[PDB]
């Protein structure tokens with residue numbers, strides 16, 4: 001919700017959250033790869049020895065123009081294994097909607113729950129609960145030979161079925177644009193009404 005009058009843009013921030021290696025970078029890289037050259041900034045990767053953050057912004061093709069303003073989305077993630085919480089907490093500053101990218105691997109079930117607990121904790125620092133921000137779950141890695149049942153994955157990350165759920169194979173693009181359409185429509189929904 002930072003309004004830029006000078007480029008006449010309204011800006012929305014979408015954070016991909018989830019356990020290390022769940023396919024967040026993959027989501028963002030797939031999306032980036034399909035946005036036309038003149039409608040995207042650079043992909044920015046920031047990294048210290050132990051901390052990381054990846055982000056880019058783009059002008060969605062399918063979004064109108066409330067009284068002369070164009071819509072720019074800013075996609076942010078903390079990719080890789082995490083050793084410190086600070087990047088995760090900071091990534092959430094000014095978030096408008098969240099895609100929780102859950103891993104289908106049975107040896108990642110606990111890390112899914114853990115990552116959802118951490119998201120909740122971090123949102124709580126900004127004074128938000130899980131109801132206060134649109135969240136969509138992507139159960140990624142459906143192509144794993146041991147992939148858990150979606151409903152099992154959802155149960156550890158969304159016990160109450162409060163959030164939409166989509167399946168993905170981010171490496172193949174499958175579920176990637178459906179996921180972003182879903183979160184984007186919930187974001188624009190909440191501003192609108």
Ligand SMILES: Nc1nc2c(ncn2[C@@H]2O[C@H](COP(=O)(O)OP(=O)(O)O)[C@@H](O)[C@H]2O)c(=O)[nH]1
Pocket residue numbers: 018019020021022023024025026027078079080081140141142143144168169170171172
């Ligand atoms: N089998 C499978 N592998 C995936 C999928 N999405 C990503 N990966 C792989 O999982 C690893 C972790 O993905 P990455 O996007 O970097 O994880 P992040 O740390 O959440 O960004 C990479 O080797 C990806 O190529 C998927 O749908 N299926």
